[PDB]
Design a binder for this molecule. Structure first.
Ligand SMILES: O=C(Cc1ccc(-c2ccc(OCCN3CCN(C(=O)CC4CC4)CC3)cc2)cn1)NCc1ccccc1
Ligand SMILES: Nc1nc2c(ncn2[C@@H]2O[C@H](COP(=O)(O)OP(=O)(O)OP(=O)(O)O)[C@@H](O)[C@H]2O)c(=O)[nH]1
Ligand SMILES: Nc1nc2c(ncn2[C@@H]2O[C@H](COP(=O)(O)OP(=O)(O)O)[C@@H](O)[C@H]2O)c(=O)[nH]1
Ligand SMILES: [Ca+2]
Ligand SMILES: [Ca+2]
Ligand SMILES: [Ca+2]
Ligand SMILES: [Ca+2]
Ligand SMILES: [Mg+2]
Ligand SMILES: [Mg+2]
Ligand SMILES: [Mg+2]
Lengths: 438, 62, 424, 313
């Protein structure tokens, strides 16, 4: 068994990690006190679920997780919450004052003075690993911590764990949901400085999740809890292969192998269906064909783009629930005969499929209804470059006037970094274009 | 459209379907840049405090 | 995240006393410092402005400063006189004579160390200080000169802490002396260098609101300070109550100040009081963006909004609020810069103020704030070109050169605003 | 009220559209680059489709269909007609065309075949970059064409020339027909009931052409020509609907199309080309643009007969 370490950085990362570990505990039948009655492996075991939990002598299942923020109220809620005794104190690392939505503050100024402690606490977990696969890094593109400190931590995890995959779960900034205005800067900077250290990154646009919660959960004012529980639904469907018996995506290396032929283009679009309100009295449950078809409606994508204008490089369909291969194959035939799905000329036009029979687990009292089958599709399509374009454009509009730049320069950064990162983004944008159009 | 590499198990199964075939920086450099940013910060702060010292000279003069 | 409050001079102390009255009422603290409220939403963020004392009394983290004891006599006698820490009344006996030089260079310098001692002893008891707020006028001598000197000293001692001010601009329509444009002009330069955010409260606007809108024929300073305290409560609402975002002074400043020198904000409030009608969200937004509801006497249509923040307070539908905000913007979108995407943000606080079932506080960083500085400048020049009244300042050690420099720095600041008003 | 922008000053049709929109009293024209808009009258090259529909609380409409260039460029049109099963391998209404994935051998083979048959070999060389008159080269000798084809910069297409066109005989005159089609956000296909034949300005409206057919050939425009025209419009637009439809997208699209046909002597309609940014007849700008406002814009942004044949499907 090949362990994985989860690192949640910043407010978005910490809260999404709260959601993810709540869902993981529910799915594995682990109580808030860390006891797993079904684990007859008291004190140890090579079980697949041990890839994310370590076992104590007293039957406690403790996440291989690290929570880090530059201010502590977000993690204080963790320390005083339902799963307070799931974690042990050293996993929860917090500072005194935060990066104030400033990439420079989180990367250079305050990051320098907590990085050694965080890496020590991470090594203390890596030492408890007979063999370590790597890390799942959760963070926001927008916050000062989640961008700056995340890029620093990635840069030096590459040095300290250079033979170990690093996967990102990144929240893409959405004006509707955010308090800030300088997030184009932080996103561009963190992406530029982290790209060479991230093997596979799953971007989630707060706009897409917000509109999904509005339309399909009938919630006019979604809270961060709604969006985060949906996000963990997707994250759990992604990581089930690592936490469960299977043959597809059992290795963090396999995520890259199956989804990332070009290291720079390592941002797979995620689509998920079905999302159904728990307030719906009765719902006509959807078929394998209806959910697989939904995997191609942009309204279900974690980022709003049009895959029709763009080419696929890879595709994984990950089903949970009552699903059989022949229904999947029928549906794939039907959809190919009716939808625009163009691959690059130098990649097989096919789908790698995985199936957990266990139906999706949903939080009791949440806004998501139980369903006997669900699917998450991971497709590396060039259309996601639209999300880059948008962001880049916003960047260009502000930096043309150097608006807000003094806040970064005041913390030690230089405009040279701004322009260097932006040129990296331009290179990535037409890298997508070259692979993408004719 | 061929089905391929089918593996099964008590908790699921996996396979592939094909519809057409085809046609790092060292630590020294992280450190020696974080420290450069810090020294730029220190220069900015030094210039600020020297400007303040100038104003205190002026206040005494007045 | 603790905040340290400082109020200097007559206007500063009067406005600060009103602010503490208002927010003590909102947080349920009585004049003795004992809590007698009816919700824990009143207390979750109470350490921001209050220290916990023996017996778990709450004492404002406020330092009261004046060069004469009058206003602080009245404060220590007034409604909430006995809540302020006795050590934190720091006063001299002479006064500043509405003279910037006396407050900054002569009389003030004799007391600034004494004030900084109390500032330090308040900062030491802070788990993590997020910054300072100062209340003062720019048209007098103590507030104006001594507060700018204090700001300089605080920056020296706390160079990496946020310094924000509520600064009352002078206006001839409500004036104490003719040398107000001088003092103001000299203070503004200081602010341009040494404040992260300065909320420009123009007495011209306060008087015009109290007269034309509230229909008060003879407004007193109390009637203007009512509005000022309402605005101050509104501005600080997001830090004092728990339902809101997670931003310290530094984060809010980071997102509201695109350029270092252009950090002078136009406050605004709605509805205007001194009634029982339930005010609707559309009316709140319309009044909030109406120039007649703003504390700086500038026309926002003569400039452009760099950033805008609005804090609604009361039980309302965030959907309706956010539709009406998007209305007022997408409608009149020629007054928002296109090079700062999504520069309008709105917060809603489930707790209302007292007397009002729905209120909106408007914080706008607009280039139209020019119009104030040019006003002051004009007044300044109108006298300085004849050296008029300069003998009041030369007699305290100042040189004409300094007046010329202060005039030039503010004419520069006006020019900088013009630069970002034409940009496309 | 509603807001819109104009990123193409050169568009006569949408120039009129914006003028009338403003005259309605419920539309505000923003500056070219303002993002807070309800409608974009966009540019013709690199329209930033990727930046639409991400504006909180704004319904955004644009006057162009992403992917519609597959139909509006002769190389792309030829590829689409040849490959897509929706259109036959050789549908009966598009000239024998070859774009020179390169088909030089195939056009050479068929041109030798017609060489030996000795009864039809006139072809035409043209490109999607013809400079409003320049670029066309009709030739009986196709060696001439191919030689200069390679003596030209961009890609070219070789169609079979209409040797025996219909002639407006009071003058022995060759002509082509222009039809205007609007596709709204729902993908309703509305054909403009007034076309033109390319009399003043060498422009003949449908009433005159219809009367001429009635008197001379004892037929009518509808039966002889317009049924085929509607069929071809419907075929072309239904073929690409899955690729371009904005039914379930974060932004919506409508577009005006100009279809160029010509007619052989047997009264058989052929498709010449599809133009994605068509002009309009001078006398009908006022009617057509009003129809666009009614059907494509106010349909989405409502205020408080028809000039269009709805080509149902
Ligand atoms: O700056 C001051 C005064 C001040 C200035 C600016 C702001 C500000 C306000 C709102 C905002 O965005 C908030 C929008 N979001 C709210 C959450 N939303 C969600 O959807 C939740 C999501 C779905 C789950 C919508 C979006 C940013 C900034 C606030 N306050 N300082 C006080 C002070 C001044 C001087 C001296 C001392 C103190
Ligand atoms: N989906 C989701 N996004 C969040 C959450 N919290 C914050 N964000 C996003 O993160 C962005 C700002 O970064 P934050 O996570 O708030 O803060 P940070 O990254 O930790 O940086 P600091 O504030 O300095 O600590 C905003 O644009 C939000 O959209 C969350 O709980 N869920
Ligand atoms: N809003 C308001 N402004 C005042 C008040 N008192 C004085 N001012 C203004 O501030 C200036 C006088 O400043 P003052 O309060 O005397 O401060 P000092 O002169 O430094 O002690 C005058 O130009 C007035 O316009 C007040 O109570 N409220
Ligand atoms: Ca086990
Ligand atoms: Ca690596
Ligand atoms: Ca003395
Ligand atoms: Ca001393
Ligand atoms: Mg944070
Ligand atoms: Mg006075
Ligand atoms: Mg054409």
């Amino acid at each position: 068994m090949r362990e994985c370490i989860s690192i949640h950085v910043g407010q978005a990362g910490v809260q999404i990690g709260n959601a993810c570990w709540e869902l993981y505990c529910l799915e594995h039948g682990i109580q808030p006190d860390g006891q797993m009655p079904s684990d007859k492996t008291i004190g140890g075991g090579d079980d697949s679920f041990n890839t994310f939990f370590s076992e104590t002598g007293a039957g406690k299942h403790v996440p291989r997780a690290v929570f880090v923020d530059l201010e502590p109220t977000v993690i204080d809620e963790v320390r005083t919450g339902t799963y307070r005794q799931l974690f042990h104190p050293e996993q929860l690392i917090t500072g005194k004052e935060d990066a104030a939505n400033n990439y420079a503050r989180g990367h250079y100024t305050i990051g320098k003075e907590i990085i050694d402690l965080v890496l020590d606490r991470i090594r203390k977990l890596a030492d408890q690993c007979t063999g370590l696969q790597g890390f799942l890094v959760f963070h926001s593109f927008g916050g000062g911590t989640g961008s700056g400190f995340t890029s620093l931590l990635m840069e030096r995890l590459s040095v300290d764990y250079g033979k170990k995959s690093k996967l990102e779960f990144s929240i893409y900034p959405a004006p509707q949901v955010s308090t800030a205005v300088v997030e184009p800067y932080n996103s561009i900077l963190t992406t530029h400085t982290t790209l060479e250290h991230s093997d596979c990154a799953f971007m989630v646009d707060n706009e897409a999740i917000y509109d999904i919660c509005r339309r399909n959960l009938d919630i006019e004012r979604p809270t961060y809890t709604n969006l985060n529980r949906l996000i963990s639904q997707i994250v759990s469907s992604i990581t089930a292969s690592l936490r469960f018996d299977g043959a597809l995506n059992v290795d963090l290396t396999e995520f890259q192998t199956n989804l990332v032929p070009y290291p720079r283009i390592h941002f797979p679009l995620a689509t998920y269906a079905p999302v159904i309100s728990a307030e719906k009295a009765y719902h006509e449950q959807l078929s394998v064909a209806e959910i697989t078809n939904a995997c191609f409606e942009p309204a279900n994508q974690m980022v709003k783009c049009d895959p029709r204008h763009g080419k696929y490089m890879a595709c994984c369909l990950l089903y949970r629930g009552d699903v059989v291969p022949k229904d999947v194959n029928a549906a794939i035939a039907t959809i190919k005969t009716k939808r625009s799905i163009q691959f690059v000329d130098w990649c097989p036009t096919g789908f790698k499929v995985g199936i957990n029979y266990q139906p999706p687990t949903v939080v009791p009292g949440g806004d998501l209804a139980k369903v006997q089958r669900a699917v998450c599709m991971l497709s590396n399509t060039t259309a996601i470059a639209e999300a880059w374009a948008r962001l880049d454009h916003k960047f260009d509009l502000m930096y043309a006037k150097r608006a807000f730049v003094h806040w970064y320069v005041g913390e030690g950064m230089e405009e040279g970094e701004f322009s260097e990162a932006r040129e990296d983004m331009a290179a990535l944008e037409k890298d997508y274009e070259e692979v993408g159009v004719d | 459209m061929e089905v391929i590499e089918l593996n099964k198990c008590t908790s699921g199964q996996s396979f592939e379907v094909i519809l057409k075939p085809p046609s790092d920086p060292s630590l020294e450099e992280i450190q020696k840049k974080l420290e450069a940013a810090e020294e730029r910060r220190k220069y900015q702060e030094a210039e600020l405090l020297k400007h303040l010292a100038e104003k205190r000279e002026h206040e005494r003069e007045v | 995240r603790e905040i340290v409050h400082i109020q200097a001079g007559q206007c500063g102390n009067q406005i600060g006393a009103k602010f503490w009255e208002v927010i003590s009422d909102e947080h349920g603290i009585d004049p003795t410092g004992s809590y007698h409220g009816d919700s824990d939403l009143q207390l979750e963020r109470i350490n921001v402005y209050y220290n916990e004392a023996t017996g778990n009394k709450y004492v404002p983290r406020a330092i009261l400063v004046d060069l004469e004891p009058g206003t602080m006599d009245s404060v220590r006698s007034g409604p909430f006189g006995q809540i302020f820490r006795p050590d934190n009344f720091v006063f001299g006996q002479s006064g500043a004579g509405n003279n910037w030089a006396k407050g900054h260079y002569t009389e003030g310098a004799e007391l600034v160390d004494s004030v900084l001692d109390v500032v330090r002893k308040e900062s030491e008891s802070c788990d993590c200080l997020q910054g300072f707020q100062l209340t003062h006028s720019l048209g007098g001598g103590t507030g104006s000169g001594m507060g700018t000197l204090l700001i300089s000293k605080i920056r020296e001692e706390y160079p990496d802490r946020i310094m924000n001010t509520f600064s009352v601009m002078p206006s001839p329509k409500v004036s104490d002396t003719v040398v107000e444009p001088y003092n103001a002009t000299l203070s503004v330069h200081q602010l341009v260098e040494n404040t992260d955010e300065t909320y420009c409260i123009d007495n011209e606007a306060l008087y015009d609101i109290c007269f034309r809108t509230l229909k008060l024929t003879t407004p007193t300073y109390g009637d203007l300070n009512h509005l000022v305290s309402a605005t101050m409560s509104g501005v600080t609402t997001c830090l004092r109550f728990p339902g809101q975002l997670n931003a310290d002074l530094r984060k809010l400043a980071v997102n509201m100040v695109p350029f270092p020198r252009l950090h002078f904000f136009m406050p605004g409030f709605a509805p205007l009081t001194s009634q029982y009608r339930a005010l609707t969200v559309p009316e709140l937004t319309q009044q909030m963006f109406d120039s007649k509801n703003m504390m700086a006497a500038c026309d926002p249509r003569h400039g452009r909004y760099l950033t805008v923040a609005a804090i609604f307070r009361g039980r309302m539908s965030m959907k309706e609020v956010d539709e009406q905000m998007l209305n007022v913007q997408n409608k009149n979108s020629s007054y928002f810069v296109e090079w700062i995407p999504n520069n309008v943000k709105t917060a809603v606080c489930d707790i209302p103020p007292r007397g009002l079932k729905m209120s909106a506080t408007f914080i706008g960083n607009s280039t139209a704030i020019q119009e104030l500085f040019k006003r002051i400048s004009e007044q300044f020049t109108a006298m300085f070109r004849r050296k008029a009244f300069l003998h009041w300042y030369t007699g305290e050690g100042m040189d004409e050169m300094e007046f010329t420099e202060a005039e030039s720095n503010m004419n520069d600041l006006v020019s900088e605003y013009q630069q970002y008003q034409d940009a496309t | 009220m509603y807001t819109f922008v104009v990123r193409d000053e050169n568009s006569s049709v949408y120039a009129e559209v914006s003028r009338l929109l403003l005259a309605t009293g419920q539309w505000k024209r923003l500056r070219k680059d303002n993002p807070r808009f309800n409608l974009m009258l966009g540019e013709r090259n690199r329209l930033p489709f990727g930046r639409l529909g991400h504006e909180p609380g704004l319904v955004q409409l644009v006057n162009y269909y992403r992917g519609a260039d597959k139909l509006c460029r002769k190389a792309s049109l030829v590829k689409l007609i040849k490959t897509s099963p929706e259109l036959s391998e050789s549908c009966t209404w598009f000239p024998e065309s070859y774009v020179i994935t390169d088909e030089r051998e195939v056009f050479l083979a068929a041109y030798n075949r017609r060489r030996e048959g000795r009864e039809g070999n006139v072809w035409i060389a043209k490109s999607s970059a013809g400079a409003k008159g320049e670029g066309i080269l009709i030739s009986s000798e196709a060696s001439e064409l191919l030689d200069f084809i390679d003596e030209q910069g961009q890609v070219h297409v070789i169609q079979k020339y209409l040797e025996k066109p219909l002639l407006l005989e009071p003058g022995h005159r060759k002509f082509d027909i222009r039809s205007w089609v609007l596709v709204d956000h729902l993908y309703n296909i509305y054909l403009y009931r007034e076309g033109v034949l390319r009399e003043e300005g060498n422009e003949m409206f449908f009433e005159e052409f219809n009367q001429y057919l009635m008197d001379a050939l004892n037929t009518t425009l509808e039966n002889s020509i317009l049924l085929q025209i509607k069929h071809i419009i419907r075929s072309c637009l239904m073929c690409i609907e899955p690729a371009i439809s904005t039914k379930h997208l974060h932004y919506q699209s409508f577009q005006l199309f100009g279809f160029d046909f010509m007619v052989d002597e047997e009264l058989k309609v052929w498709l010449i080309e599809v133009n994605g940014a068509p002009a309009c007849a001078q006398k009908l700008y006022a009617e057509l643009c009003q129809g666009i406002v009614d059907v494509a814009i106010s349909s989405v942004f409502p205020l408080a007969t028809s000039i269009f044949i709805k080509l149902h499907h």
